[PDB]
Write a protein that binds this ligand. Structure first.
Ligand SMILES: Nc1nc2c(ncn2[C@@H]2O[C@H](COP(=O)(O)OP(=O)(O)O)[C@@H](O)[C@H]2O)c(=O)[nH]1
Ligand SMILES: Nc1nc2c(ncn2[C@@H]2O[C@H](COP(=O)(O)OP(=O)(O)O)[C@@H](O)[C@H]2O)c(=O)[nH]1
Lengths: 168, 168
């Protein structure tokens, strides 16, 4: 029943930073007497219980067996690039296309995120990213994990996209 | 075709340390003109191409949707405890039992690893661990990522267990 969110994108774009900040602000301790220690942590976003996973394909993950499994399991995807890393923006399309193939679906809940919007060394313009999101039919949000701008907004937006998809 | 190895165990036992050390010693750059950049890194152990994944269930992973997927995908498991952490040893049985349920199999290639054997603050005796491995019918090896003792031996042993299982 939980909303299954997957954060995906190139290395070093801030996927871990964004996810850690989200957890810090949204984790709760839940009483559950059907488990050994009687309490478990969960993340609740916009009234919805959420599971969170990060899909990397670089570094250690260039050796993983699990890429396609993450894409099959995930329900909605936060597609992250960094606004000072043109290659990370170019890499978005590959991840989206892979997700659609693995899920065998034209309709998958996604949000495009341009992270590191605090930085002055921008090489990806807001309009380039807007154009990409418009083509996909999805929201685009600029965020900063460093300055804590729109981090919550990005995850809330994805939760809404999943909720809408579940109504279809 | 690749051998799919999963490293599993409690938090802080040295799963990342062991895996990083293995990769450092066994990664190769492979020529493959069917991919964009023409080269990809792979890990080769005992002549076998291997994929590597780490299954954690604590910390960030207490929020994951992926536990059972790791267990279904993995072919052989390196079940790690630390010899200065009695709880991590007690936790092994739960992981093994979960793996067997998810895989719906009584026969799964595994190796039991007691890591941190460099430490003088031992609370898990070699004989306790030997007894557990004997019950399961699997090898037991003590390792140290810090002093680089038997790290390669642990992964080679698991590769042999998988190879034997593939012959059945
Ligand atoms: N300036 C800035 N740095 C960030 C931001 N988010 C992450 N970083 C830094 O970018 C690097 C990569 O972040 P990380 O979370 O490890 O990225 P991942 O590899 O995508 O998980 C780290 O040094 C972070 O501190 C951000 O919004 N602004
Ligand atoms: N003394 C000692 N420390 C180790 C050894 N392996 C890992 N560590 C330390 O134990 C801690 C946890 O290791 P880590 O690889 O992060 O464990 P994981 O959470 O199971 O992936 C870190 O501080 C490591 O440096 C070992 O063989 N000996």
């Amino acid at each position: 029943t939980e909303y299954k969110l997957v954060v995906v994108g190139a290395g070093d774009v801030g996927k871990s930073a964004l996810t850690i900040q989200l957890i810090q602000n949204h984790f709760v301790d839940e009483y559950d007497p059907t488990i050994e220690d009687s309490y478990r942590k969960q993340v609740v976003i916009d009234g919805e219980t959420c599971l969170l996973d990060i899909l990397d394909t670089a570094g250690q993950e260039e050796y993983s067996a699990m890429r396609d499994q993450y894409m099959r399991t995930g329900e909605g995807f936060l597609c992250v690039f960094a606004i000072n890393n043109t290659k990370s923006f170019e890499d978005i399309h590959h991840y989206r296309e892979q997700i659609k193939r693995v899920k065998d679906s034209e309709d998958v809940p996604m949000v495009l995120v341009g992270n590191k919007c605090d930085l002055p060394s921008r090489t990806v313009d807001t309009k380039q990213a807007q154009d990409l999101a418009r083509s996909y039919g999805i929201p685009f949000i600029e965020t900063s994990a460093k300055t804590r701008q729109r981090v919550e907004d990005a995850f809330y937006t994805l939760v809404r996209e999943i909720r809408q998809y579940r109504l279809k």
